[PDB]
Amino acid sequence: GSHSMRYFFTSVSRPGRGEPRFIAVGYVDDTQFVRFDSDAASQRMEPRAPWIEQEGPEYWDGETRKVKAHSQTHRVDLGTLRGYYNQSEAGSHTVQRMYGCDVGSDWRFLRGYHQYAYDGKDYIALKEDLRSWTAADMAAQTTKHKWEAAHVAEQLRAYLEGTCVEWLRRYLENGKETLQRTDAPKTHMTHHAVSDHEATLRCWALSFYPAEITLTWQRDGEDQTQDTELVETRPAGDGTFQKWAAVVVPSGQEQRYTCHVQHEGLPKPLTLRWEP
Amino acid sequence: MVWGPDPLYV
Amino acid sequence: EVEQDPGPLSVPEGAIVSLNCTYSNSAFQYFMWYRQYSRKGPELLMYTYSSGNKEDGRFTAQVDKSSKYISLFIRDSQPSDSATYLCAMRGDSSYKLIFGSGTRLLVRPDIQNPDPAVYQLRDSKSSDKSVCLFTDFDSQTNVSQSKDSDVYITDKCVLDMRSMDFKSNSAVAWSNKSDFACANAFNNSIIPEDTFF
Amino acid sequence: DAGVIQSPRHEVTEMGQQVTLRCKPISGHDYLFWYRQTMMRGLELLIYFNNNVPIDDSGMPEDRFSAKMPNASFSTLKIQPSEPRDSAVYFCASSLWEKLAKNIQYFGAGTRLSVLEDLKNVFPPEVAVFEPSEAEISHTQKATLVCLATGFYPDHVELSWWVNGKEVHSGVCTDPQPLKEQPALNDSRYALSSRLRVSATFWQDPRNHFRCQVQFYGLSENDEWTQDRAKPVTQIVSAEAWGRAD
Amino acid sequence: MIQRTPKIQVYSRHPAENGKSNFLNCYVSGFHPSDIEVDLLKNGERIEKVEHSDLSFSKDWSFYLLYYTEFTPTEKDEYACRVNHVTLSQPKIVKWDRDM
């Protein structure tokens, strides 16, 4: 199917410390493969997936130089934005930046993006054409003017359509057994008396990859979602994910409810009923 | 690969 | 690494000049040409990203990323284009530029009215010493001299009398020995020329 | 409208001493580059800085060389101890992101550094002006003066012509390189020539005074000197002539 | 300054069996700003040498993190996750439930 490479950068100002905290992470699909943390002793971009450890010293010197340069830019952006909003130098503030590219099933370029937030809300963003910007407010409008005068869209377009996409393809091939490979969910149902007149059916999907998954409850074949809970998808810590969906039911009507599971690792969708 | 050599200030 | 032929290239005024460079690293994405006058800093002329051709007046720059070959063409070359030309390049992970070793270019001025002559000159001060000025010769009438026997001759240099519309070649010789005189001061290929008594 | 300012413009020093090169970037610029050019013929980047932090120093020699930027308007490149192979022109440049995206950077005038095996080799030039011949003035109605600067070492001289107390550029031609007075020697002394051409009538006016001036860069006051011979210090040497219709 | 309080899930890496070595996870998500304190508890006492993932964030810009430690669950041992954040006047303790 389609695949992504995304990098996430967070910078937090710290009044009374010398530098802001900067943290950078990169993913391919739902798999993390690198990190940088300004507070760690290494001061290098560091591998987090076995298949990037094979890249040589030129790769790691470059990635580290670039990611250190992003932290220096956010260090200045923190002071500029404090100024624009006339904020006290006493408070902690956040910048976040996310960019990357998607690629289709043919591995050709689908889309590219670049978003920037201040204190958890949209500040500036590249539109889908990769030639223009959306700005949230008058401070962002000033940056927009700056970035238009400096031709930042052109630089980024070239990276997103060239470099981003190419190295994504390259990471897909190296680590094929990790990234391309699919773990179907291991499933089961539990049952709980919640009262004297009611009972919970909980449908589990365990140990799957990737994380996209759809869990639904039908009653007598009729998709329905009243007194349903589906928990947020969660990492197991091994590179796999977990999720459940629950329904509260009249005591006795157990057999009438069915749990449907869709995951690209399943040949055909799975159906489950409470067994006894 | 990250974008480089570097981004521009806001 | 970057390969550039050092020259020197010597061409007549009005000529089209071609300078070029090769590289091996496919990560280079930006390509620039600089010009540098003798004992001065480099001045950017043209720059290219990725591939293609770019004209600016008399200059065209070209990049073929597949042959890893780049070029600068100068139409209608002038005396003031005489300089060393350097190419430079970088990728996207650093602002570090990698330079070629440069190509030296001489563009020889056109002289309408040659009038070659060797003149002797008297020392100004309370001292009787001698220097032979070879002047007014043609641009393509050049000096292969590096003469020992401790007569020194300087290579040629071009004066622009800006007041009036006048360009001129010149070169100079001297010797400690007063068993030395002007009209034999050149072994190299002169054309027949002025002297007087 | 000040560009990048580099100091000193010339440095002549004995091997073993500390050399300091300085650069003041254009104010407002946050990137600063140090390059080196030797007549092994091209430029090479030593290091660059951004916001005073060093970014890429792969071109830095592994030993003896250290660069700092202690504030946004000042960077230093130091060599302790200096060796002859360090002689070079060292250029400093500065820029901003948006100029660097079109590969524009602004270059200082450079520091020209000569580190010498031995200061006993250093000599200032002797300078003579020679006067036009009557032959030239009759045949062409133009008049050429020549200046000869001879016997200097090392190769740090700037020659200028002055008439009636103002520097002139019209009619002046001065060798781009200087001669070596014995080419087969390594540390040959050097020589240089320049010509000034003027109208015949301009030479024939006795109220015109012509001066050929050579600035030599050599030893400073903190260099030691023992020889029974003048200390070959940084200095100006000149020579003069007057017009005549006679 | 928008401030979003964390969602918390406490769960084990593999199905829990008494006396079998496993991993206890506390996943915190949906929060802003990023400063957050998370402890894993055994019978009210902090476990030491807990690890966490590298800070990242979702489409709405809210942050998420996984904290974890090796453990071997028992019948009578109670586990829990304790989280503090600027949006809480005091810590949320969330008890681990085998079938949560």
PDB file of C-alpha atoms in Angstrom, chain A residues 8-10 12 23 25 27 32 35 48 92-94 96-98 115-117 119-122 190 192 202 204 206 231-238 242 244, chain E residues 1-2 4 7 9-15 23 25 27 29 32-35 52-64 66 68 97-100:
ATOM      1  CA  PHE A   8       8.869  15.432  14.037  1.00  0.00           C
ATOM      2  CA  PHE A   9      10.822  18.250  15.806  1.00  0.00           C
ATOM      3  CA  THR A  10       9.919  19.687  19.225  1.00  0.00           C
ATOM      4  CA  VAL A  12      10.722  23.775  24.403  1.00  0.00           C
ATOM      5  CA  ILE A  23      13.894  16.487  20.370  1.00  0.00           C
ATOM      6  CA  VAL A  25      12.378  11.765  15.699  1.00  0.00           C
ATOM      7  CA  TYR A  27       9.530   7.461  11.252  1.00  0.00           C
ATOM      8  CA  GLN A  32      10.678   4.910  14.419  1.00  0.00           C
ATOM      9  CA  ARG A  35      16.267  10.289  17.126  1.00  0.00           C
ATOM     10  CA  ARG A  48      16.486   3.302  16.538  1.00  0.00           C
ATOM     11  CA  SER A  92       8.037  28.036  28.853  1.00  0.00           C
ATOM     12  CA  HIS A  93       6.831  27.864  25.231  1.00  0.00           C
ATOM     13  CA  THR A  94       6.845  25.222  22.450  1.00  0.00           C
ATOM     14  CA  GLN A  96       6.744  21.966  16.752  1.00  0.00           C
ATOM     15  CA  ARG A  97       7.556  21.139  13.155  1.00  0.00           C
ATOM     16  CA  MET A  98       6.472  18.181  11.132  1.00  0.00           C
ATOM     17  CA  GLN A 115       3.607  22.223   9.249  1.00  0.00           C
ATOM     18  CA  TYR A 116       4.676  24.523  12.047  1.00  0.00           C
ATOM     19  CA  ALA A 117       2.966  25.151  15.377  1.00  0.00           C
ATOM     20  CA  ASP A 119       2.226  26.446  21.716  1.00  0.00           C
ATOM     21  CA  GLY A 120       0.255  23.583  20.293  1.00  0.00           C
ATOM     22  CA  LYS A 121      -1.640  25.471  17.592  1.00  0.00           C
ATOM     23  CA  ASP A 122      -1.208  25.906  13.885  1.00  0.00           C
ATOM     24  CA  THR A 190     -13.707 -11.566  27.001  1.00  0.00           C
ATOM     25  CA  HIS A 192     -17.726  -9.485  32.182  1.00  0.00           C
ATOM     26  CA  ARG A 202     -14.638  -6.979  24.826  1.00  0.00           C
ATOM     27  CA  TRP A 204      -9.227  -7.695  21.407  1.00  0.00           C
ATOM     28  CA  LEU A 206      -3.208  -7.979  19.735  1.00  0.00           C
ATOM     29  CA  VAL A 231      -9.877   2.418  23.012  1.00  0.00           C
ATOM     30  CA  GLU A 232      -7.187   4.397  21.232  1.00  0.00           C
ATOM     31  CA  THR A 233      -4.683   2.235  19.310  1.00  0.00           C
ATOM     32  CA  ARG A 234      -1.627   1.594  21.476  1.00  0.00           C
ATOM     33  CA  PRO A 235       1.948   0.314  21.072  1.00  0.00           C
ATOM     34  CA  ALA A 236       2.968  -2.936  22.731  1.00  0.00           C
ATOM     35  CA  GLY A 237       6.668  -1.861  22.864  1.00  0.00           C
ATOM     36  CA  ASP A 238       7.905  -4.513  20.350  1.00  0.00           C
ATOM     37  CA  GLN A 242      -2.948  -3.377  20.388  1.00  0.00           C
ATOM     38  CA  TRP A 244      -9.933  -3.332  21.740  1.00  0.00           C
TER      39      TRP A 244
ATOM     40  CA  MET E   1      -1.570  28.552  26.076  1.00  0.00           C
ATOM     41  CA  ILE E   2      -3.916  25.657  25.207  1.00  0.00           C
ATOM     42  CA  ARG E   4      -4.597  19.309  27.207  1.00  0.00           C
ATOM     43  CA  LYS E   7      -5.132  10.070  28.285  1.00  0.00           C
ATOM     44  CA  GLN E   9      -3.514   3.408  29.446  1.00  0.00           C
ATOM     45  CA  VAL E  10      -1.828   0.908  31.712  1.00  0.00           C
ATOM     46  CA  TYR E  11      -1.383  -2.557  30.200  1.00  0.00           C
ATOM     47  CA  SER E  12       1.091  -5.381  29.713  1.00  0.00           C
ATOM     48  CA  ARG E  13       3.054  -6.217  26.587  1.00  0.00           C
ATOM     49  CA  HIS E  14       1.813  -9.842  26.459  1.00  0.00           C
ATOM     50  CA  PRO E  15      -1.174 -11.539  28.069  1.00  0.00           C
ATOM     51  CA  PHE E  23       6.494  -5.742  30.499  1.00  0.00           C
ATOM     52  CA  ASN E  25       3.398  -0.262  30.026  1.00  0.00           C
ATOM     53  CA  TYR E  27       1.048   4.970  27.551  1.00  0.00           C
ATOM     54  CA  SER E  29      -1.132  10.625  25.005  1.00  0.00           C
ATOM     55  CA  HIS E  32       0.162  19.526  25.950  1.00  0.00           C
ATOM     56  CA  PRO E  33       2.588  20.957  26.941  1.00  0.00           C
ATOM     57  CA  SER E  34       5.205  18.252  26.939  1.00  0.00           C
ATOM     58  CA  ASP E  35       6.545  18.363  30.513  1.00  0.00           C
ATOM     59  CA  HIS E  52      10.376   5.670  28.001  1.00  0.00           C
ATOM     60  CA  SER E  53      10.145   6.254  24.239  1.00  0.00           C
ATOM     61  CA  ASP E  54      11.326   9.390  22.410  1.00  0.00           C
ATOM     62  CA  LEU E  55       8.840  12.238  22.649  1.00  0.00           C
ATOM     63  CA  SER E  56       6.653  12.541  19.546  1.00  0.00           C
ATOM     64  CA  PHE E  57       3.292  14.002  18.555  1.00  0.00           C
ATOM     65  CA  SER E  58       0.072  13.471  16.613  1.00  0.00           C
ATOM     66  CA  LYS E  59      -1.864  15.354  13.944  1.00  0.00           C
ATOM     67  CA  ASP E  60      -3.557  17.683  16.504  1.00  0.00           C
ATOM     68  CA  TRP E  61      -0.046  18.453  17.861  1.00  0.00           C
ATOM     69  CA  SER E  62      -0.682  16.702  21.139  1.00  0.00           C
ATOM     70  CA  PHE E  63       2.187  14.663  22.526  1.00  0.00           C
ATOM     71  CA  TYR E  64       2.487  10.965  23.348  1.00  0.00           C
ATOM     72  CA  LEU E  66       5.369   5.110  26.290  1.00  0.00           C
ATOM     73  CA  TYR E  68       7.747   0.686  30.521  1.00  0.00           C
ATOM     74  CA  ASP E  97      -6.341  -4.155  35.060  1.00  0.00           C
ATOM     75  CA  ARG E  98      -5.451  -7.467  33.374  1.00  0.00           C
ATOM     76  CA  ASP E  99      -8.677  -7.219  31.215  1.00  0.00           C
ATOM     77  CA  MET E 100      -8.840  -3.364  31.497  1.00  0.00           C
TER      78      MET E 100
END
